[PDB]
């Protein structure tokens, strides 16, 4: 294990792989990156700083181009105590790189490592690297490039084989057959909402690749406090704005001003019956087109409406999640579980539970009834950037900054799926309305479409240039809309993308990006922060013009 | 400035120091009073427009063309 | 006055208004309220050593 | 506090085995006891001035005016959730109809309705049957940790949010 | 109670800092302008803090008036426990 | 092994307020406060003894760590 | 008969479905379906799980017959089953047909 | 400037292409604040050891005793996975469920009568 | 002969509702939590001894 010769062990295996035949060379190039980091981090942990920086400058140049932001965090790490407080490379050193390889290429690898001529790079491989073997064809280089890029990358197939109830509630065999929780205590006012919701569904247009939807951009014009969070209600009636001046601002977009309910003295005199139910309590003295909400001590990063159009949620840098009423327009609860910036929050689509992901590398499940969470989803190695509920709300998808997307079962808090293949931190997730698919976007401009019953990320959409910060499917599921920092709203055919949909863990996905594009829609200097679909299939977007 | 007792100035910031390389390093104390204060800009408002009408981008002034 | 001595003192002034903003909001919200009274600032200024 | 001198002297010496500090000076075990006292007396006084912060009743004084009582929003909840319970009862009155034959079925279901409700009420009844002393909560200790510079970003305050 | 009797006399007495500027830095921290006399006390408490430093830096300038320097602010804030920094750039 | 007997801690509260009952979740953490702190005083006071090349832990080593890192200032 | 939910057995169960009410089994649905299963199960077990007989005496206070269910309350009453001798000064008896 | 041109290379080595001009000025203000509190503590530690020259072990002591208090980190992975399995297997007892505006106990919420002074 | 009947009934009931829990979309872990929650309340009450309580 002499450190003086780590540039002789790694360069010997680098000489074996590049001298191999081209079918096995592209698959054996996967263990360049984890063997470079695990040898570099073991040098700096054993205080070999002088012969660690020479190991870096020799071998960091022959890495893949999508690891460039990963190596510059390693160039700063030269001491041991610098790495003892990083907590991402501390969890990288103790975990195992999974490194899915085929059995046709593993036989050439094990015939070069079981011999005692090498005998130490084989000791590093069987100490720091898992190897998950599949029986099949060796993957191509542009297929290996599609499914790598994460620390602890390309997770095992034994993680993606659990039974996931990805179906919708009310048959659906891949979904809880009889429970079908139709919203905790579905009320008569909540049943009155779905009556006027299906009147909107009557006017809903079938979008497809021919009837392209109209996009109504709701730009924030002045916005000199930086807009950090947008949410729209399920019916296009309210638009929330989270801003960098520690405010949440609700706007009514329908011609109906935002009213608070009357004070407790005015409600006590309201006589029994004589109507007096949901209009007699609304105060007309307080009626604006804009309500500003104060109380966060930091920039508000998450914004989430409840499906009953009360109960705004907001999370911010100060480590609290706040539940604002939309009947009194005050704050109700401050959920203090993180000490760190909560980057996202979202209500359940049935409106009781909510999930919040923060800088402390967990995502908590709350219930609006307890000051403490119910489930802690604590398997990510970096910040939980996104947190999205499944349409049946039994599963929570948490994208993160360690380039992985993970599905979490609400029962038992177990990770049931691990989706790797992004090259940057994931900044947007959305689910298909079927519940069978999941679209994720990240800073590499790639929209990767994942299956949930299988977990193979069947499609890849690579039209965007900068960070894809907003995704949504249509109300029918016909079109996925993507909005990025390129100031473009791209529309993708979300029917021709899933038309085809194992024993090998991949489907050999094509370059269908050009065929799946329906439009690009460049925006005037305005990053598309939110994308929303009206129930009559009209795209809404909100941007904060710069 | 650094407060070793930490209590009058905790982790709240003071917005930095408006200092330059080509500054004068001495001003008169009534020059700062007699200058007019800058105008507080307009508050944030929400205007809606159309990026796309059934696939086509309109040539309104809220659009690039 | 010197120029750097004015941008120093107006930085301590902005940091002082922003510190009674964050601490008197924290003292009232600790007592389950949302807007601060007089009794929340005369405890905020005591915790900054003011001699009110 | 004035810590007990005999178990403290064994306590210092066992941590001294890990550094090679085999014996201690005779004025140290009473100095650490005076140092532990001024640590907790600085914390007992700090939690006492926030345990008396909640015992200031404004409503006895008439220099103060009430501005916003959210809690009576609770009376609005009683009017609403109770109103929802009344509509649920109306839904039950509709179930009554479905649940000569029809008339008979109503009484058949009534047999396992009110008697069952009475049994449930008995179950609730059995379940129910089953000086200004200032008290410092864990909130008062947490409030005095995130304000000071030490222990503001610490693993002892972060774990205290879950205790 | 003198301080309650003091704040009830602040419907007049515009202070040295405006309430559009004191109220701006209070809104930045969540403090909202419910009572305008509440703003004027915070604007008075922030004046008195700056005035007590400029009155004590004058005593450290008479021993060595007519100009406030960083070597006058340095011993003036040292009894406050505040170590001021010279830019040195 | 326990150095604070949970009854002398209740006399530390009776001296401040003859009327102050702590919680059992608070007394159990008020012990952990003393536990981790006795540990953290001596672990850095005995690097000061190793700094003076002296294996005896005189009271000047414990007193120096209180004044510089904790600002306690208890005399000898 | 949702009769036996007022039993140690039945309440311990609900307190379980109520810990799920707050965390996973939100309101009825699942929980209600489980209780329904419980009713069938407890009723079935009672009628055919064996039993042993006896005879005894008492003093009375109140009674209530509604929904074919008798509810009595006896005072100063002692009941003996087989060998076991017992006393009581306040006993409540709920009896289904 | 000399030290301000190196600050634009520390940011460009971290890939920060776009930044405000006041960003360099206050990272130099932090770097000056950090070295005048290491070296201030270094001569305090030198006077403790009674040596007239502040040598490299004094700066080694003053760095690791300032990094033990100032620069903290998030909790570690073996600590986060222990409090997770203690919480994800705990049955989180019970409170008051159906309460219309469903909420924690009232000492954990921000819903109080919220008084104010009478204007007189 | 009474703790025996109770064990007997608890076992039968638990076994007989497993499929219902499953049909409703539930993890077997929840079932075990039920049994634990159930068994525990009797032990806490201490009206008689139980095998589960001893464990």
UniProtKB/Swiss-Prot annotation, chain A:
Repeat (WD) residue spans along the chain: 222-261, 295-334, 337-378, 379-420, 421-460, 463-501
Domain free text: Distinct domains of TAF5/TAFII100 are required for functional interaction with transcription factor TFIIFB (RAP30) and incorporation into the TFIID complex.
Keyword Transcription: yes
Subunit architecture: Homodimer. Component of the TFIID basal transcription factor complex, composed of TATA-box-binding protein TBP, and a number of TBP-associated factors (TAFs), including TAF1, TAF2, TAF3, TAF4, TAF5, TAF6, TAF7, TAF8, TAF9, TAF10, TAF11, TAF12 and TAF13. The TFIID complex structure can be divided into 3 modules TFIID-A, TFIID-B, and TFIID-C. TAF5 forms the TFIID-A module together with TAF3 and TBP, and in TFIID-B with TAF8. Component of the TFTC-HAT complex, at least composed of TAF5L, TAF6L, TADA3L, SUPT3H/SPT3, TAF2, TAF4, TAF5, GCN5L2/GCN5, TAF10 and TRRAP. (Microbial infection) Interacts with SV40 Large T antigen.
Family: Belongs to the WD repeat TAF5 family.
One BP term from GO: regulation of transcription by RNA polymerase II
Protein name: Transcription initiation factor TFIID subunit 5
Molecular function GO labels: identical protein binding; RNA polymerase II general transcription initiation factor activity
Spans annotated as NTD2: 1-132
GO annotations of cellular component type: actin cytoskeleton; chromatin; nucleoplasm; nucleus; SAGA complex; transcription factor TFIID complex; transcription factor TFTC complex
Disulfide topology: none
Keyword Transcription regulation: yes
Protein localization: Nucleus
UniProtKB/Swiss-Prot annotation, chain C:
Induction details: Induced with triglyceride accumulation.
Compartments (UniProt record): Nucleus; Cytoplasm
Histone-fold domain residues: 1-50
Disulfide bonding pattern of the chain: none
Domain of life: Eukaryota
Protein family (similarity comment): Belongs to the TAF8 family.
General function of this protein: The TFIID basal transcription factor complex plays a major role in the initiation of RNA polymerase II (Pol II)-dependent transcription. TFIID recognizes and binds promoters with or without a TATA box via its subunit TBP, a TATA-box-binding protein, and promotes assembly of the pre-initiation complex (PIC). The TFIID complex consists of TBP and TBP-associated factors (TAFs), including TAF1, TAF2, TAF3, TAF4, TAF5, TAF6, TAF7, TAF8, TAF9, TAF10, TAF11, TAF12 and TAF13. The TFIID complex structure can be divided into 3 modules TFIID-A, TFIID-B, and TFIID-C.
Quaternary data: Component of the TFIID basal transcription factor complex, composed of TATA-box-binding protein TBP, and a number of TBP-associated factors (TAFs), including TAF1, TAF2, TAF3, TAF4, TAF5, TAF6, TAF7, TAF8, TAF9, TAF10, TAF11, TAF12 and TAF13. Interacts with TBP, TAF1, TAF6, TAF10, TAF11 and TAF13. Component also of a small TAF complex (SMAT) containing TAF8, TAF10 and SUPT7L. Forms a heterodimer with TAF10. Interaction with TAF10 is mediated mainly via its histone fold domain while interaction with SUPT7L is via its C-terminal region.
Miscellaneous comment in the UniProt entry for this protein: 'Taube nuss' means 'empty nut' in German.
Gene: TAF8
Curated annotation (Swiss-Prot), chain F:
Self-association state and partner proteins as the record states: Component of the TFIID basal transcription factor complex, composed of TATA-box-binding protein TBP, and a number of TBP-associated factors (TAFs), including TAF1, TAF2, TAF3, TAF4, TAF5, TAF6, TAF7, TAF8, TAF9, TAF10, TAF11, TAF12 and TAF13. Component of the TATA-binding protein-free TAF complex (TFTC), the PCAF histone acetylase complex and the STAGA transcription coactivator-HAT complex. Component of the PCAF complex, at least composed of TADA2L/ADA2, TADA3L/ADA3, TAF5L/PAF65-beta, SUPT3H, TAF6L, TAF9, TAF10, TAF12 and TRRAP.
Modified residues annotated as Phosphothreonine in this record: 5
Function as written in the Swiss-Prot or TrEMBL entry: The TFIID basal transcription factor complex plays a major role in the initiation of RNA polymerase II (Pol II)-dependent transcription. TFIID recognizes and binds promoters with or without a TATA box via its subunit TBP, a TATA-box-binding protein, and promotes assembly of the pre-initiation complex (PIC). The TFIID complex consists of TBP and TBP-associated factors (TAFs), including TAF1, TAF2, TAF3, TAF4, TAF5, TAF6, TAF7, TAF8, TAF9, TAF10, TAF11, TAF12 and TAF13.
Subcellular location: Nucleus
Family of the protein in this entry: Belongs to the TAF12 family.
Part of the full-length chain shown: 55 to 130 of 161
Tissue: Ubiquitous.
Coiled coil spans: none
Protein name: Transcription initiation factor TFIID subunit 12
The Histone-fold domain, residue ranges: 5-72
Domain of life: Eukaryota
Curated annotation (Swiss-Prot), chain G:
Molecular function per GO: protein heterodimerization activity; protein homodimerization activity; RNA polymerase II general transcription initiation factor activity; RNA polymerase II general transcription initiation factor binding; RNA polymerase II-specific DNA-binding transcription factor binding; TBP-class protein binding
Pfam families found in the cross-reference section: TFIIA_gamma_C, TFIIA_gamma_N
Subcellular location: Nucleus
Domain of life according to the entry: Eukaryota
Keyword list, A-Z: Host-virus interaction, Nucleus, Transcription, Transcription regulation
Lyase in keyword set: no
GO cellular component annotations of the record: cytosol; nucleoplasm; nucleus; transcription factor TFIIA complex; transcription factor TFIID complex
GO terms of biological process kind: positive regulation of transcription by RNA polymerase II; positive regulation of transcription initiation by RNA polymerase II; RNA polymerase II preinitiation complex assembly; transcription by RNA polymerase II; transcription initiation at RNA polymerase II promoter
Database matches in SUPFAM superfamilies: Transcription factor IIA (TFIIA), alpha-helical domain, Transcription factor IIA (TFIIA), beta-barrel domain
Keyword Aminoacyl-tRNA synthetase: no
Predominant subcellular localization, coarse grouping: nucleus
InterPro entries, per the entry: TFIIA_a-hlx, TFIIA_b-brl, TFIIA_gsu, TFIIA_gsu_C, TFIIA_gsu_N
Its biological purpose: TFIIA is a component of the transcription machinery of RNA polymerase II and plays an important role in transcriptional activation. TFIIA in a complex with TBP mediates transcriptional activity.
PANTHER family: TRANSCRIPTION INITIATION FACTOR IIA SUBUNIT 2 (PTHR10966)
Organism, scientific name: Homo sapiens
């Amino acid at each position: 294990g002499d450190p003086t010769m780590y540039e002789e062990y790694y360069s010997g295996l680098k000489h074996f792989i590049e001298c191999s035949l081209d079918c096995h060379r592209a698959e054996l190039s996967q263990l360049f990156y984890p063997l470079f980091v695990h040898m570099y981090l073991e040098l700096v942990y054993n205080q070999h700083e002088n012969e660690a920086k020479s190991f870096f400058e020799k071998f960091h140049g022959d890495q893949e181009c999508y690891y460039q932001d990963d190596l510059r965090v390693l160039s700063s790490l030269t001491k041991k105590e610098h790495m003892k407080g990083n907590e991402t490379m501390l969890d990288f050193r103790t975990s195992k790189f999974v490194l899915r390889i085929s059995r046709d290429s593993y036989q050439l690898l094990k015939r070069h490592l079981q011999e005692k001529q090498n005998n130490q790079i084989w000791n590093i491989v069987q100490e720091h690297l898992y190897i998950d073997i599949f029986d099949g064809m060796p993957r191509s280089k542009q297929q290996i490039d599609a499914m790598v890029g994460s620390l602890a990358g390309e997770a095992k197939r034994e993680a993606n084989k659990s039974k996931v109830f990805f179906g919708l509630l009310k048959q659906d065999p891949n979904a809880p057959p009889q429970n079908r929780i139709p919203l905790p205590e579905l009320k008569d006012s909540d049943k009155l909402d779905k009556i006027m919701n299906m009147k909107e569904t009557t006017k809903r247009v079938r979008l497809g690749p021919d009837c392209l939807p109209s996009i109504c951009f709701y730009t924030f014009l002045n916005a000199y406090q930086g807009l950090t969070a947008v949410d729209v209600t399920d019916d296009s009636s309210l638009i929330a704005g989270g801003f960098a001046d520690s405010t949440v601002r609700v706007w009514s977009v329908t011609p109906k001003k935002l009213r608070s309910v009357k004070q407790a003295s005015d409600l006590s005199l309201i006589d029994k019956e004589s109507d007096d139910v949901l209009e007699r309590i609304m105060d007309e003295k307080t009626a604006s087109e804009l309500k500003i909400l104060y109380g966060h001590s930091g920039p508000v990063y998450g914004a989430s409406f409840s499906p009953d159009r009360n109960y705004l949620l907001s999370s911010s840098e100060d480590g609290t999640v706040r539940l604002w009423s939309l009947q009194t327009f005050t704050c109700l609860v401050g959920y203090k579980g993180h000490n760190y910036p909560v980057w996202d929050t979202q209500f359940s689509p049935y409106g009781y539970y909510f999930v919040s992901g923060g800088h402390d590398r967990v995502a908590r499940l709350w219930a609006t009834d307890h000051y403490q969470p119910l489930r802690i989803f604590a398997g990510h190695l970096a910040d939980v950037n996104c947190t999205r509920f499944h349409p049946n709300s039994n599963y929570v998808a948490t994208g993160s900054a360690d380039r992985t997307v993970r599905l979490w079962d609400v029962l038992n808090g177990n990770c049931v799926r691990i989706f790797t293949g992004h090259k940057g931190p994931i900044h947007s997730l959305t689910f298909s309305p079927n519940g069978r698919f999941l679209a994720t976007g990240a800073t590499d401009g790639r929209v990767l479409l994942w299956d949930i019953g299988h977990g193979l990320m069947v499609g890849e959409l690579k039209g965007h240039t900068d960070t894809v910060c907003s995704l949504r499917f249509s109300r029918d599921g016909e079109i996925l809309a993507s909005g990025s920092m390129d100031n473009t709203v791209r529309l993708w055919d979300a029917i021709k993308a899933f038309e085809d949909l194992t024993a090998t863990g991949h489907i050999n996905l094509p370059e269908n990006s050009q065929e799946l594009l329906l439009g690009t829609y460049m925006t005037k200097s305005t990053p598309v922060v939110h994308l929303h679909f009206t129930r009559r299939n009209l795209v809404l977007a909100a941007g904060a013009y710069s | 400035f650094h407060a070793q007792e930490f209590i009058p100035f905790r982790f709240a910031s003071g917005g930095g120091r408006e200092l330059y390389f080509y500054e004068e390093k001495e001003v008169d104390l009534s020059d700062i009073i007699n200058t007019p204060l800058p105008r507080v800009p307009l508050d944030v408002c929400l205007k809606a427009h159309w990026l796309s009408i059934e696939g086509c981008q309109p040539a309104i002034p809220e659009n690039p063309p | 006055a010197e120029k750097a001595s004015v941008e120093t003192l107006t930085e301590m002034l902005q940091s002082y208004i922003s510190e009674i903003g964050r601490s008197a909001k924290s003292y009232c919200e600790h007592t389950a309220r949302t807007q601060p009274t007089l009794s929340d600032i005369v405890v905020t200024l005591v915790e900054m050593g003011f001699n009110v | 506090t004035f810590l007990l001198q005999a178990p403290l002297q064994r306590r210092i010496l066992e941590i001294g085995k890990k550094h090679g500090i085999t014996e201690l000076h005779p004025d140290v075990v009473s100095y650490v006891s005076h140092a532990t006292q001024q640590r907790l007396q600085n914390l007992v006084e700090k939690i006492s001035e926030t345990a008396q912060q909640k015992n200031f009743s404004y409503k006895d004084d008439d220099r103060y005016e009430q501005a916003s009582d959210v809690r009576a929003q609770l009376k609005f909840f009683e009017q609403l959730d109770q109103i929802e319970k009344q509509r649920k009862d109306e839904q039950e009155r509709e179930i009554l109809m479905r649940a000569q034959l029809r008339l008979k079925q109503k009484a058949k279901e009534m047999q396992q309705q009110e008697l069952a409700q009475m049994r449930q009420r008995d179950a609730n009844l059995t379940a129910l049957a089953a000086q200004r002393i200032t008290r410092v909560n864990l909130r008062d200790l947490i409030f005095c940790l995130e304000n000071e510079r030490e222990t503001s970003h610490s693993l002892l305050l972060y774990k205290a949010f879950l205790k | 109670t003198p301080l309650v009797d003091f704040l009830m006399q602040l419907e007049d007495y515009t202070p040295t800092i405006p309430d559009a500027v004191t109220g701006y830095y209070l809104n930045r921290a969540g403090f909202e302008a419910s009572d305008p006399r509440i703003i004027r006390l915070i604007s008075l408490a922030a004046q008195k803090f700056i005035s007590d430093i400029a009155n004590d830096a004058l005593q450290h300038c008479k021993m060595k008036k007519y100009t406030l320097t960083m070597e006058d602010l340095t011993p003036a804030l040292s009894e406050y426990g505040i170590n001021v920094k010279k830019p040195h750039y | 092994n326990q150095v604070l007997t949970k009854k002398k801690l209740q006399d530390l509260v009776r001296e401040v307020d003859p009327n102050e009952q702590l919680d059992e979740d608070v007394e159990e953490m008020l012990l952990q406060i003393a536990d981790d702190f006795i540990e953290s005083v001596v672990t850095a006071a005995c690097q000061l003894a190793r700094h003076r090349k002296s294996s005896t832990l005189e009271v000047k080593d414990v007193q120096l760590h209180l004044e510089r890192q904790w600002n306690m200032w208890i005399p000898g | 008969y949702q009769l036996y939910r007022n039993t140690t057995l039945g309440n311990s169960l609900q307190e379980s479905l109520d810990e799920l009410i707050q965390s996973q089994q939100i309101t009825p649905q699942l929980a209600l379906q489980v209780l329904l299963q419980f009713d069938k199960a407890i009723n079935a077990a009672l009628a055919q799980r064996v039993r042993n007989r006896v005879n005894f005496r008492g003093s009375l206070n109140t009674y209530r017959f509604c929904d074919n269910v008798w509810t009595f309350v006896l005072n100063d009453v002692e009941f003996r089953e087989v060998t076991e001798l017992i006393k009581v000064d306040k006993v409540k008896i709920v009896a289904c047909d | 400037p000399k030290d301000a041109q190196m600050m634009a290379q520390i940011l460009k080595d971290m890939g920060i292409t776009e930044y405000e001009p006041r960003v360099i000025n206050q990272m130099l203000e932090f770097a000056f604040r950090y070295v005048t509190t290491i070296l201030d503590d270094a001569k305090i530690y030198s006077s403790h050891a009674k040596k007239a020259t502040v040598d490299a072990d004094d700066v080694r002591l003053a760095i690791q005793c300032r990094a033990d208090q100032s620069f903290t980190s998030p909790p570690p992975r073996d600590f986060l996975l222990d409090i997770a399995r203690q919480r994800n297997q705990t049955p989180l007892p019970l409170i008051k469920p159906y309460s219309g505006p469903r909420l924690p106990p009232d000492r954990y919420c921000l819903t109080a009568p919220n008084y104010r002074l009478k204007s007189l | 002969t009474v703790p025996k009947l109770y064990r007997s009934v608890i076992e039968d009931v638990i076994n007989d509702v497993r499929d219902i829990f499953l049909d409703d979309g539930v993890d077997e872990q929840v079932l075990m939590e039920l049994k634990t929650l159930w068994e525990n309340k009797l032990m806490q009450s201490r009206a008689v001894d139980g095998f589960h309580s001893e464990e």
